[PDB]
Write a protein that binds this ligand. Structure first.
Ligand SMILES: CCCCCCCCCCCCCCCCCC(=O)OC[C@H](COP(=O)([O-])OCC(O)COP(=O)([O-])OC[C@@H](COC(=O)CCCCCCCCCCCCCCCCC)OC(=O)CCCCCCCCCCCCCCCCC)OC(=O)CCCCCCCCCCCCCCCCC
Lengths: 61, 119, 269, 59, 74
């Protein structure tokens, strides 16, 4: 199910919000590394966390 | 301000002046000269001058600013970023207040109205 | 009477930082050894300038360092068309006499400059302005004629053109004003009272989720089963929107012997 | 066997693997950058086929 | 490409990443077009301040001496 967090959406009603989740979920393609799975991908496995470029501690120091 | 990833190269060339500079797209080959490992998305490499900015941040995160950042791959990234935002700021102002200097503008060589032809 | 030191001297605390950009073992080892003995080394050169002594730039081995010039596609052929591409190589290859000549200004930017009007022409302009603010415009005919007579004709052409430029720039700034101050259809009847009490940080990643599926852990617990049910719902909503589709328009660039319109390119070929 | 015994199965996968932009998007997806696709994005390979001269309908 | 840092900031490239597909990514570029016209208009409303604050008037007759720099030919 959808997990809530600090970063919220930008929709007024709940129907607009639920429609956005349905659009995003219907585009998800699971890529698992374990055999005997309907979504199995030894190579070309996608990450589930987006990388963000930030100034490190050595940068600002 | 350019509101896209790509721009026509001819639209930033002068029509009534000698063309001594161009406004080239980001040099993606410089991205492969970084020796360390880093994550870069292809969705950020075409917008003007931003690739050189991200390369500078990656170099200033791996190395610092003292005796380790001073290598040819990192100094060219910072120089390109500074030069790119300077040229684009000048071309942007020239595009805004001197649009008639560039190829493709209808005022570079104005076509006359039919009432001026005397027919 | 000590010589003045620049701010960079307080960053490095020395005048002899043996900075060499060439990242080979022989160069950096010799630079470290020379950096330690620079206080008692007769063959020592400064790279930090001071009020009393000039300095050298960044070293490149035995030669000197300068960054790669910014990519410039302008070039001039000598023998055959080389089709020079500044993005095809990392370091710009040197120009051979029979092959190519590059554009001027290896290290140059685009600026706007202005000539300085002659000093006598400036003095007549100051006299007219002063006589104008003291006596008024109608009693400055003598000072107005001195400008047209003493100022050379090229200066009068520049003065005439500056007025036309700033008139052009004035209209360009006001057209941006009219577009900026235009009330859009989504802001009709909205005032400062309807603004949300938020700042710039409230629209960042921590507070406003980006439009990507892995920006955070929102969809990390979604299974295949819920995906299949979501596809059934997005296709159910399309049972009402697919009824509308724009009609195919005419190709304005159908004639190849006609100057085509610079129309927006397709997202994909 | 269904992929091998098909005629267009070889072409659909080859045209997608030869499209450099679709591979750049796929490279970003593996790195963690993914989102929803519009109807125009889902046809990015069909546009690439038409540009080459193939007869693909349903754009 | 003027107002680079302003446009990069409005697109959210300082905290997040652009959508990986050209459709939404190119719409996000055209979305800041109104804001650039607004921010550029604001920067042109600055009131004037005395020019003779950190800069002596170069047209003053005191500087008609056209003095040169005396040097020592070491
Ligand atoms: C000169 C002659 C002599 C020398 C010969 C040398 C031959 C080598 C040259 C290479 C030949 C060309 C064929 C290359 C095929 C590409 C393979 C590949 O890259 O892997 C991807 C491939 C697919 O990745 P995935 O995890 O399924 O993707 C999941 C995503 O969800 C996917 O979804 P997505 O949304 O993320 O999209 C990702 C995107 C990514 O796009 C790309 O990156 C482009 C990929 C390029 C391929 C596109 C063109 C496909 C053309 C189809 C026709 C090919 C026919 C084969 C030609 C052979 C010529 C005789 O799309 C793809 O994934 C492309 C699909 C790739 C399928 C490849 C077709 C299957 C081949 C059928 C025959 C199988 C024979 C295997 C026999 C092995 C025996 C040991 O990975 C595998 O196949 C794993 C191997 C199979 C698992 C079983 C375990 C076997 C272990 C064997 C170990 C030993 C290895 C061999 C050792 C040899 C010495 C002893």
């Amino acid at each position: 199910p959808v997990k809530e967090g600090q970063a919220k959406l930008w929709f007024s009603t709940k129907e607009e919000a639920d429609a956005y989740d349905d659009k995003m979920i219907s585009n998800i393609e699971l890529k698992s590394q374990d055999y005997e799975d309907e979504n199995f991908s030894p190579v070309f496995n996608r990450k589930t966390q987006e990388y963000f470029l930030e100034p490190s501690e050595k940068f600002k120091s | 301000t350019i509101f896209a990833e790509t721009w026509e190269a001819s639209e930033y060339q002068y029509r009534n002046k000698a063309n001594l500079k161009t406004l080239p797209v980001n040099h993606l080959g410089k991205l492969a000269e970084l020796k360390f490992d880093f994550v870069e998305y292809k969705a950020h490499q075409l917008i003007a001058c931003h690739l050189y900015e991200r390369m500078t941040i990656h170099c200033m995160n791996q190395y610092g600013l003292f005796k380790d950042f001073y290598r040819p791959e990192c100094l060219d990234a910072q120089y390109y970023f500074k030069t790119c935002v300077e040229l684009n700021a000048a071309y942007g102002i020239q595009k805004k207040f001197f649009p008639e200097h560039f190829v493709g503008s209808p005022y570079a060589r104005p076509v006359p109205q039919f009432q001026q032809l005397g027919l | 009477k000590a010589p003045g030191q620049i701010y960079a001297y307080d960053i490095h605390n020395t005048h002899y930082p043996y900075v060499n950009i060439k990242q080979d073992s022989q160069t950096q080892l010799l630079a470290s050894f020379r950096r330690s003995i620079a206080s008692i080394n007769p063959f020592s050169y400064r790279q930090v300038p001071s009020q009393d002594r000039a300095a050298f730039g960044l070293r490149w081995g035995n030669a000197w360092y300068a960054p790669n010039p910014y990519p410039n596609g302008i070039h001039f052929d000598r023998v055959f068309p080389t089709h020079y591409d500044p993005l095809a190589e990392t370091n710009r290859t040197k120009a051979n006499l029979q092959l190519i000549k590059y554009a001027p200004g290896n290290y140059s930017t685009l600026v706007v400059t202005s000539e300085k009007l002659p000093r006598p022409c400036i003095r007549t302009i100051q006299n007219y302005r002063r006589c104008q603010m003291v006596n008024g415009t109608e009693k400055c005919n003598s000072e107005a004629q001195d400008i047209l007579a003493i100022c050379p004709n090229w200066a009068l052409d520049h003065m005439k053109e500056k007025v036309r430029f700033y008139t052009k720039a004035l209209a360009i700034n006001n057209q941006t004003y009219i577009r900026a101050m235009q009330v859009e259809e989504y802001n009709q009847g909205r005032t400062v009272a309807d603004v949300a009490p938020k700042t710039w940080i409230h629209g960042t990643r921590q507070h406003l989720r980006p439009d990507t599926m892995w920006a955070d852990d929102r969809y990390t617990n979604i299974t295949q089963t819920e995906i299949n049910e979501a596809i059934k719902r997005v296709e159910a909503r399309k049972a009402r929107e697919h009824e509308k589709k724009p009609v195919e328009q005419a190709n304005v660039n159908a004639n190849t012997g006609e100057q085509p319109v610079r129309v927006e390119k397709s997202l994909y070929p | 066997m269904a992929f091998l015994s098909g005629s267009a199965t070889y072409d659909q996968l080859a045209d997608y693997a030869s499209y450099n932009h679709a591979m750049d998007v796929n490279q970003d997806q593996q790195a963690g950058l993914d989102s929803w696709m519009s109807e125009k994005d889902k046809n990015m390979v069909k546009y690439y086929q038409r540009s080459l001269g193939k007869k693909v309908e349903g754009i | 490409m003027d107002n680079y840092f302003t446009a990069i900031t409005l697109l959210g490239l300082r905290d997040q990443n652009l959508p990986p597909f050209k459709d939404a990514r190119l719409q996000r570029y055209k979305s800041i077009k109104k804001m650039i016209d607004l921010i550029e208009t604001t920067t042109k409303l600055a009131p004037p301040m005395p020019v003779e604050l950190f800069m002596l008037n170069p047209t003053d007759p005191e500087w008609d001496d056209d003095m040169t720099y005396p040097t020592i030919t070491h």
